Write a protein that binds this ligand. Structure first.
Ligand SMILES: [Cu+]
Length: 120
């Protein structure tokens, strides 16, 4: 509580990406394995990283099976790394809009967030 928040990324095209702050209020660990949203057909769960090829340093991205958050702790889907990919959007979405995410937590759980959309 503070921020604790996120934003969905601008795109008028077929796909987008989403960044957000995961926080665990429980005494047991939470584990984010999936998601949902009213502005996609697929969600996918991704990482992002720095990488070397030929001694020349670039960035890259991959899908991943889940994220972990320890009890009383927090971890963001940060723009310098982990994020959802949203594909098959239902608003062509843009700076100053408004979007839900649903976050599928391991063993019978879910969290809902509401995020703004940003040209970020
Ligand atoms: Cu991605």
């Amino acid at each position: 509580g503070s921020f604790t928040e996120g934003w969905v990324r601008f795109s008028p095209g077929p796909n987008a990406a989403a960044y957000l702050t995961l926080e665990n209020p429980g005494d047991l660990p939470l584990r984010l394995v999936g998601a949902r949203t009213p502005v996609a057909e697929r969600v996918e769960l991704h990482e992002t990283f720095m990488r070397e090829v030929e001694g020349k340093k670039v960035m890259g991205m991959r899908p991943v099976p889940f994220l972990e958050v320890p009890p009383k702790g927090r971890v963001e889907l940060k723009p310098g790394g982990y994020h959802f990919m949203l594909l098959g959007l239902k608003r062509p979405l843009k700076a100053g809009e408004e979007v839900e995410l649903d976050l599928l937590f391991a063993g019978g759980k879910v969290l809902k967030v509401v995020l703004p959309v940003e040209a970020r």
